[PDB]
UniProtKB/Swiss-Prot annotation:
GO CC terms, sorted: mitochondrial intermembrane space; mitochondrial matrix; mitochondrion
Assembly, per entry: Forms a one-to-one complex with cytochrome c.
The enzyme's E.C. designation: 1.11.1.5
Residues carrying the site annotation Transition state stabilizer: R45
Lineage: Eukaryota, Fungi, Dikarya, Ascomycota, Saccharomycotina
Record organism: Saccharomyces cerevisiae (strain ATCC 204508 / S288c)
UniProt protein name: Cytochrome c peroxidase, mitochondrial
Gene Ontology biological process terms, A to Z: cellular response to oxidative stress; hydrogen peroxide catabolic process; response to reactive oxygen species
């Protein structure tokens, strides 16, 4: 399959900036969500999950098609709890009905990160809604109860190497797990709605205890009240991963640059951008525009 990016007819940068500003104003207003964490986290998770079904082998899945809109994908057990990000974007879509779904789902992740003080993520428009039959089957998203090998292997399918995997995982600094959703419970740190290298620090500085939770699954618990999934923990069990965790724990900048590149790639996987395609856009935050 070849998925060529096709710009929404007659729209430009300014048009996308407006979609971004709307998502952003809504993030600021609906701040009570999940006990005051806000929807930032959940949006970031939404953008990763619609992008993560990609398969470098036959080019199926990935962000392009906005397949998450279909029942099959929408009811994926691994996407439990994403319905909240969806419901949050709906009114935005209603306001800007010419944007494709894939472009919207992905733009929300960028918006969330940038408004939560993370780095600027260049983003590209062009995703095109595809038919319900292009919807990927469930089971392509990762399990959390595994080790570093499973992780390396899994990631490979999305074309990401070690450095990319570690950078992307630092997104775990945001939000938290929910028993009802994933069988895991608790946040990964304290500033759960601000984008920082906290994840790396917690992983290296806390005194973690393995324990089983109320869903009868194992998780690493810290006395600070934080948690880490086996997959996150695996980052300090693997020597190659561990040196990267260290690097990030030590340099937020680095982490920010690496995350930015990785995140964009992840969201662009499976998409072909013609040479005439516009450059990636860099949106201003609400703050940069004085709004
Ligand atoms: C092996 C890789 C991954 C696994 C196994 C994993 C698994 C999980 C699980 C089990 C949840 C908690 C869901 C809940 O109960 O609500 C979670 C939440 C989250 N995921 Fe990951 N995840 C992975 C990779 C990623 C990546 C690459 C990103 C983005 C770069 C992502 C961003 C997050 C965010 C931001 C949250 C919090 C959502 C919220 O607070 O509602 N994670 N992840």
């Amino acid at each position: 399959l070849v998925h060529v990016a096709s710009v929404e007819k007659g729209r430009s940068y300014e048009d996308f900036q407006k979609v971004y500003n709307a998502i952003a104003l809504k993030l600021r207003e609906d701040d009570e969500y999940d006990n005051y964490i806000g929807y930032g986290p959940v949006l970031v998770r939404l953008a990763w999950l619609i992008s993560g079904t990609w398969d470098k082998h036959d080019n199926t899945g990935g962000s392009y098609g906005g397949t998450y809109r279909f029942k099959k994908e929408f009811n994926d057990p691994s996407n439990a709890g994403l319905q909240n990000g969806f419901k949050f974007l709906e009114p935005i879509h209603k306001e800007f009905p010419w944007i494709s779904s894939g472009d919207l789902f992905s733009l929300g992740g960028v918006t969330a990160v940038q408004e939560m003080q993370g780095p600027k993520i260049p983003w590209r428009c062009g995703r095109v809604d595809t038919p319900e039959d292009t919807t990927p089957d469930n089971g392509r998203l990762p399990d959390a109860d595994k080790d570093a090998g499973y992780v390396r292997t899994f990631f490979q399918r999305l074309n990401m190497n070690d450095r990319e995997v570690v950078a992307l995982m630092g997104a775990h600094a945001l939000g938290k797990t929910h028993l009802k959703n994933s069988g895991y419970e608790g946040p990964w740190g304290a500033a759960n709605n601000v984008f920082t290298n906290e994840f790396y620090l917690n992983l290296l500085n806390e005194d973690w205890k393995l324990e089983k939770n109320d869903a009868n699954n194992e998780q690493w618990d810290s006395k600070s009240g934080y948690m880490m999934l086996p997959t996150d923990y695996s980052l300090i069990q693997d020597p190659k991963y561990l040196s990267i965790v260290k690097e990030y724990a030590n340099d937020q900048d680095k982490f920010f640059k690496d995350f930015s590149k990785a995140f964009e790639k992840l969201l662009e996987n499976g998409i072909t951008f013609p040479k005439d395609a516009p450059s990636p856009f860099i949106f201003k935050t609400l703050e940069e525009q004085g709004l």
